Design an enzyme around this catalytic site. Sequence first.
Site, PDB file in Angstrom:
ATOM      1  N   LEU A  85      -8.779   4.031   2.402  1.00  0.00           N
ATOM      2  CA  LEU A  85      -9.794   4.612   1.531  1.00  0.00           C
ATOM      3  C   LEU A  85     -10.678   5.589   2.300  1.00  0.00           C
ATOM      4  O   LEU A  85     -11.219   5.254   3.346  1.00  0.00           O
ATOM      5  CB  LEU A  85     -10.656   3.500   0.904  1.00  0.00           C
ATOM      6  CG  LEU A  85     -11.812   3.955  -0.011  1.00  0.00           C
ATOM      7  CD1 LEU A  85     -11.260   4.489  -1.308  1.00  0.00           C
ATOM      8  CD2 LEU A  85     -12.815   2.815  -0.258  1.00  0.00           C
ATOM      9  N   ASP A 142      -6.006   6.287  -5.057  1.00  0.00           N
ATOM     10  CA  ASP A 142      -5.556   4.921  -5.160  1.00  0.00           C
ATOM     11  C   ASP A 142      -5.607   4.451  -6.638  1.00  0.00           C
ATOM     12  O   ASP A 142      -5.868   5.257  -7.543  1.00  0.00           O
ATOM     13  CB  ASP A 142      -6.359   4.041  -4.186  1.00  0.00           C
ATOM     14  CG  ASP A 142      -7.791   3.794  -4.634  1.00  0.00           C
ATOM     15  OD1 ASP A 142      -8.535   3.131  -3.886  1.00  0.00           O
ATOM     16  OD2 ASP A 142      -8.261   4.198  -5.714  1.00  0.00           O
ATOM     17  N   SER A 167     -12.099 -20.040  -6.322  1.00  0.00           N
ATOM     18  CA  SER A 167     -10.757 -19.973  -5.759  1.00  0.00           C
ATOM     19  C   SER A 167     -10.784 -20.367  -4.271  1.00  0.00           C
ATOM     20  O   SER A 167      -9.917 -21.093  -3.809  1.00  0.00           O
ATOM     21  CB  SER A 167     -10.159 -18.557  -5.917  1.00  0.00           C
ATOM     22  OG  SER A 167     -10.050 -18.166  -7.288  1.00  0.00           O
ATOM     23  N   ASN A 183      -6.538 -20.101 -10.842  1.00  0.00           N
ATOM     24  CA  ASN A 183      -7.891 -19.548 -10.829  1.00  0.00           C
ATOM     25  C   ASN A 183      -7.944 -18.085 -10.334  1.00  0.00           C
ATOM     26  O   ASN A 183      -8.696 -17.271 -10.870  1.00  0.00           O
ATOM     27  CB  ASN A 183      -8.797 -20.413  -9.975  1.00  0.00           C
ATOM     28  CG  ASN A 183     -10.247 -20.033 -10.107  1.00  0.00           C
ATOM     29  OD1 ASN A 183     -10.794 -19.319  -9.268  1.00  0.00           O
ATOM     30  ND2 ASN A 183     -10.878 -20.495 -11.166  1.00  0.00           N
ATOM     31  N   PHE A 219      -8.466  -6.382   2.639  1.00  0.00           N
ATOM     32  CA  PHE A 219      -8.040  -5.004   2.856  1.00  0.00           C
ATOM     33  C   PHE A 219      -8.112  -4.203   1.535  1.00  0.00           C
ATOM     34  O   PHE A 219      -8.577  -3.055   1.502  1.00  0.00           O
ATOM     35  CB  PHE A 219      -6.613  -5.010   3.406  1.00  0.00           C
ATOM     36  CG  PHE A 219      -6.106  -3.665   3.874  1.00  0.00           C
ATOM     37  CD1 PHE A 219      -5.535  -2.772   2.973  1.00  0.00           C
ATOM     38  CD2 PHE A 219      -6.140  -3.319   5.223  1.00  0.00           C
ATOM     39  CE1 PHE A 219      -5.043  -1.532   3.402  1.00  0.00           C
ATOM     40  CE2 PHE A 219      -5.633  -2.100   5.658  1.00  0.00           C
ATOM     41  CZ  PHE A 219      -5.092  -1.203   4.743  1.00  0.00           C
ATOM     42  N   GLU A 223       0.798  -1.234   0.000  1.00  0.00           N
ATOM     43  CA  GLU A 223       0.000   0.000   0.000  1.00  0.00           C
ATOM     44  C   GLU A 223       0.831   1.285   0.000  1.00  0.00           C
ATOM     45  O   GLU A 223       0.333   2.348  -0.360  1.00  0.00           O
ATOM     46  CB  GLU A 223      -0.938   0.011   1.216  1.00  0.00           C
ATOM     47  CG  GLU A 223      -1.973  -1.099   1.221  1.00  0.00           C
ATOM     48  CD  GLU A 223      -3.014  -0.953   0.122  1.00  0.00           C
ATOM     49  OE1 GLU A 223      -3.797  -1.902  -0.068  1.00  0.00           O
ATOM     50  OE2 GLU A 223      -3.062   0.108  -0.543  1.00  0.00           O
TER      51      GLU A 223
END
Length: 164
Positions: free
Chosen positions: A32, A20, A117, A132, A104, A11
Amino acid sequence: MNIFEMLRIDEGLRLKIYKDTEGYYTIGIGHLLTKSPSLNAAKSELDKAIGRNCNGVITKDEAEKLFNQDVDAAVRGILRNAKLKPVYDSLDAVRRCALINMVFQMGETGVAGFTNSLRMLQQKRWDEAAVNLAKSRWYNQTPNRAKRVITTFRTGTWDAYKNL
Ligand SMILES: [Cl-]
Ligand SMILES: [Cl-]
Ligand SMILES: [Cl-]
């Protein structure tokens, strides 16, 4: 290596409001603020988040406080989610960090939609899950990050995070 160091790598750290990868106002370590295109709306969220009039700038301490809250909330969210909790409980600690990283980044709902998945991960079909996971908007839009997260899920090691 741990979830905090891992997400700090993925990040970054910025002390002024930025956009972002999706174009959304963000600050700190991938916190965010809003999906609104109004910078004023983002600043109001930031002031509310920090508890003072910030004018779009925070300290490192403040960014790390938001980060701690955000990691804590991701984990609590996983544990309250009927689709994610069984997956999380099935995984070792390194792969659990992969799962927290994804939540996250994209939120609970988005991760919970990786139904196929998640099944492969629960079955411990690591190579097949990795294949996948890459068939996704997520991988195409953030391929370097997705590759690191996928390698973590595939190997159950931190190898993708140690040249960094
Ligand atoms: Cl907040
Ligand atoms: Cl985030
Ligand atoms: Cl990326």
